[PDB]
Design a protein around this ligand. Structure first.
Ligand code: NA
Ligand code: NA
Lengths: 248, 248
């Protein structure tokens, strides 16, 4: 029995007063979700203090959407895992496809980010995923395998047991193709096998493609999908809670 | 006369209790500095709320070390200029050499960041600077000129009159080489001419190389150097205030 999780990635959205509305609604609605679902939100850096003040003591966790590969130094604009941790955050997303694409983050850089998260007392949500070109070239397993291996290679098994992994079907996001639950399960089963070989087979594997209120039950019903890293639906409390309830 | 400014770039340093100590010392010391010097600190994103609570109503301004090229969207980890503005920040650093190198930010991306900063009511500190390879190839003017032109091209003159520009001699970093005051002036005079041709000739031009208590007066005495964007010396209140006082 592995941990079920529904974690919202707000991405670059939110201002103080809209954040307070979403956070109150989610905290109030979360009381009605089955108690085995770990619910969390990852907010933009400046609002970590707000998320703490509003959610502290409740069942909703919070986190950042990135952390630096280093603990300190001449890295203008970057935020250290140690900084995020001081606001009682539980999570840090590392290696999101948007950052691998737009910021050029390599497999090895993501591995360093995972380690920094752990060292600071956060649970890293380690994102992996292949592009359309990669999938059509038949290299899905080589790619997401190399991404995950790079992270596992710098951790002991006991450290690896503490991560979360998220699969993003980048090939189905704004390309004209779409993913089925079965196609998701196929990659999750592959990733589960790599985790087991490391001795981290119990780690939560979250689906990070398009998750909406109408498809959550089908996706989360798959045997190796333990929940979701939710995009746009995480911005409207009704949709987000609907998704949280489907993870029972 | 143009606005004299000394702005500390903390880079990726600081935790809550050390931040409070530095902020207190700087605010207290700032009360004795000549009143024509605009003193500011740019802090990591999670501490913008802390800088506001501690500095509000005083003469020390605060800012972020970056802002997104976009106002909102699917840009996991990125922080919008609007978000920074809600914490009463006056500044955002855009195009720092560390971000052009480590994050691949192009000339045109920096220009978009400047615009987002202005639209949100921040003063962007637009960083320009050439590498060693560039300087030794004789291309200093072609490079820093292109970097500045990209930002000026997307602004009207009235908009351009609101920016700050900082020159970073990237060629002096980890190279053993150093810049003289006369060399700094030569580049500033070139950048001043480009600003004047746009109708933005009154803009503050800050020197962003290595500034220490013992060299500040010589650098800031140059006719086109209006102050400094300070690195490591910004981390110790005594050294930072020394630098601030020299901008009289
Ligand atoms: Na399942
Ligand atoms: Na001067």
């Amino acid at each position: 029995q592995r941990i079920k999780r529904v974690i919202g990635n707000w991405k670059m959205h939110g201002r103080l007063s809209g954040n307070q509305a979403l956070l109150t609604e989610v905290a109030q609605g979360a009381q009605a979700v089955h108690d085995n679902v770990a619910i969390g939100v990852c907010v933009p850096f400046p609002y970590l203090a707000q998320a703490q003040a509003q959610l502290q003591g409740g069942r909703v966790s919070w986190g950042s959407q990135d952390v630096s590969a280093h603990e300190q130094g001449a890295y203008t604009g970057e935020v250290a895992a140690g900084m995020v941790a001081e606001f009682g955050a539980a999570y840090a997303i590392v290696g999101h496809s948007e950052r691998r694409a737009y910021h050029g983050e390599s497999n090895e850089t993501v591995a360093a980010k995972a380690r920094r998260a752990l060292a600071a007392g956060l649970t890293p949500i380690v994102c992996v995923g292949e592009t359309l070109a990669e999938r059509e070239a038949g290299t899905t397993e080589q790619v997401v395998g190399a991404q995950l291996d790079a992270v596992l290679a710098v951790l002991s098994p006991d450290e690896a047991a503490r991560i979360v992994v998220a699969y993003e079907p980048v090939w189905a996001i704004g390309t004209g193709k779409s993913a089925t639950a079965e196609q998701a399960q196929q990659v999750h089963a592959f990733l589960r096998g790599r985790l087991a070989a490391k001795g981290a087979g119990h780690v939560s594997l979250l689906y990070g493609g398009s998750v909406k209120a109408d498809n959550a039950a089908e996706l989360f019903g798959q045997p190796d999908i333990d929940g979701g890293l939710i995009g746009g639906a995480s911005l409207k409390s009704g949709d987000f809670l609907a998704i949280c309830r489907a993870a029972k």
